[PDB]
Design a binder for this molecule. Structure first.
Ligand SMILES: [Ca+2]
Ligand SMILES: [Ca+2]
Ligand SMILES: [Cl-]
Ligand SMILES: [Cl-]
Ligand SMILES: [Cl-]
Ligand code: NA
Ligand code: NA
Ligand code: NA
Ligand code: NA
Ligand code: NA
Length: 287
DNA sequence: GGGGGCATGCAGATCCCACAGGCGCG
DNA sequence: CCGCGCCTGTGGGATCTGCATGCCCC
């Protein structure tokens, strides 16, 4: 269907915005636990169509409101997780979140085998949870004080294809237009920010795209891959996402963005009339 | 028949996004 | 001189992540 999302683009978007959760909460009855596995993407409700298209591609998950500005797709039901696992086995994540998925998959197998009901089975879930995301809370640490290891292998993966990069960029990327006054100057920029735990992957964008720069700051837990040279934006960045379509509102930013690139390519941004259309397109992107 | 799991949420923490200014270089 | 773009810097909210529990069903 027209609303289907390329499975690599979906994995790339998951690498950007998704989250694998393992909730282990006290249940009342003596020493019983709620055990909840989940995959979640929460967005501004201006991008609810993304979540609906993902739900339509996978045929699992429930869309819910969060506040008045946000909306999330949550996959949680036991059989629904098998569809998540089957997709990610075949279209694997490449950021550090691969580690979280693999622990999530490991907890799933523990629960599918009913091992978390045996006398010494919840401790295994706690051990898995401690390695996921932000690890254990204080309460779980007090109830399982012997579970201290957060060691897990670091993920080292290459960008698999442009479909993945389109999904990743649709999440964590940015296409914007700069105007600077010395004459009013125009500048197209492309940037992706990311936590330094994936510094190798972000570094590799320079090779994979044949342009750009990695900036880190002298302060900083996150870095930026950025392209500021116009001919790199025109000859390398724009063709890559023409071949691999972005999703959500960022595709609209891109389409507006390229319209500015066409104007500047024709040198028609120097024209006072050409610059005035650039200001209009930019005012439209602010929406 | 107690719990395991679902349905359906709410709440906290931070990693992003969409930028701006200074300035050298060709 | 001039325009490009390398390089530094960042506010704050859209993300990422964690927390909650009554109901259903075997
Ligand atoms: Ca991200
Ligand atoms: Ca995003
Ligand atoms: Cl949820
Ligand atoms: Cl983290
Ligand atoms: Cl223990
Ligand atoms: Na949710
Ligand atoms: Na950015
Ligand atoms: Na170039
Ligand atoms: Na956007
Ligand atoms: Na984090």
């Amino acid at each position: 269907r027209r609303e289907s999302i390329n499975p690599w683009t979906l994995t790339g978007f998951a690498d950007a915005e998704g989250s694998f959760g393992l909730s282990i909460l006290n249940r009342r009855g003596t020493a019983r636990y709620h055990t909840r596995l989940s995959f979640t993407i929460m967005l501004h409700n201006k991008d609810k169509s993304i979540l609906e298209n993902i739900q339509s591609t996978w045929k699992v998950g429930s869309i819910l409101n969060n506040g008045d500005h946000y909306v999330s797709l949550v996959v949680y039901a036991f059989e629904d997780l098998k569809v998540i696992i089957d997709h990610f086995e075949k279209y694997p994540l490449i950021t550090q979140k691969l580690g979280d998925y693999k622990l999530f998959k490991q907890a799933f197998s523990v629960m599918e085998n009913k091992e978390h009901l045996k006398e010494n089975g919840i401790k295994e879930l706690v051990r898995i949870k401690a390695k996921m995301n932000w690890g254990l809370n204080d309460e779980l640490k007090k109830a399982f004080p012997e579970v201290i290891s957060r060691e897990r292998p670091l993920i080292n993966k290459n960008i698999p294809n442009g479909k993945w990069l389109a999904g990743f960029t649709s999440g964590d990327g940015s296409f914007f237009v700069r105007l600077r006054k010395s004459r009013v100057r125009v500048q197209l920029v492309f940037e992706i920010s990311q936590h330094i735990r994936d510094k190798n992957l972000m570094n590799s964008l320079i090779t994979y795209l044949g342009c750009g720069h990695i900036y880190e700051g002298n302060k900083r837990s996150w870095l930026q891959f950025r392209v500021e040279k116009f001919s790199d934006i025109n000859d390398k960045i724009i063709p890559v996402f023409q071949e691999n379509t972005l999703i959500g509102m960022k595709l609209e930013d891109f389409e507006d963005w390229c319209k500015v690139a066409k104007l500047i390519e024709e040198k028609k941004h120097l024209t006072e009339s050409g610059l005035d259309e650039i200001k209009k397109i930019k005012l439209n992107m602010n929406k």
